[PDB]
Homo-oligomer: A and B are copies of this chain.
Amino acid sequence: SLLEFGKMILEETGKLAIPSYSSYGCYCGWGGKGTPKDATDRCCFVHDCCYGNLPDCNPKSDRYKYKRVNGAIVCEKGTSCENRICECDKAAAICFRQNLNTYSKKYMLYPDFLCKGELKC
């Protein structure tokens, strides 16, 4: 759930998930259409696709446990859903960090009509 994902985001980026990654570009937020606008937006797109591979799970509400070992995020053994969701979240938070150099405020509060089209995954 956002509790765990958000914690990862803050730990990796020094930004609060809401609002730094909740209205950015076409994919960092909710709703899902258009061409990702930059590297950070691509992280989000990949994150959605990652969740998309888990139709029997519910990442909005599925809580899971993760810990830090040797400085790195470790998705603790749980259910298949918990582990897979955790790995999705971990990959995205690290992707956000790796791309902080191009994080652009111009993409925050990004309008709907600038994001058209369906990009299947």
Q: Select one of B3, B61, B111 contacting A98, CB under 8 A.
A: B111
Contact of A53 among B1, B6, B91, B111 (CB under 8 A): B6
Chain B residues near A60: list those with CB within 8 A. Answer: 119
Inside 8 A of A42's CB, which chain B residues have their CB?
Answer: 30
Tallying the copies of this chain within the complex gives 2
| Residue with the highest number of chain B CB atoms closer than 10 Å, among A2, A19, A50, A60 | A19
Complex CA gap A18/B46 in Å reads 7
Chain B residue with the shortest CB-CB distance to A30: B42
Give the interface residue-count category, chain A: 20 to 34
Contact indicator B87/A120 (Cβ below 8 Å): no
How far does the alpha carbon of A82 sit from the alpha carbon of B39 in the complex, in Å?
Answer: 27
Chain B residues within 8 Å of A95, by CB: 23, 109
Q: In chain A, residues 15-54, which have Cβ atoms closer than 8 Å to a Cβ of chain B?
A: 16-19, 22-23, 30, 39, 42, 46, 49-50, 53
Which 8 A/B pairs are nearest by Cβ-Cβ distance? A2-B121, A3-B120, A1-B120, A18-B50, A19-B91, A98-B111, A18-B49, A16-B53
- A residues at B contact (CB < 8 Å): 1-3, 6, 16-19, 22-23, 30, 39, 42, 46, 49-50, 53, 60-61, 63, 84, 87-88, 91, 94-95, 98, 109, 111-113, 119-121
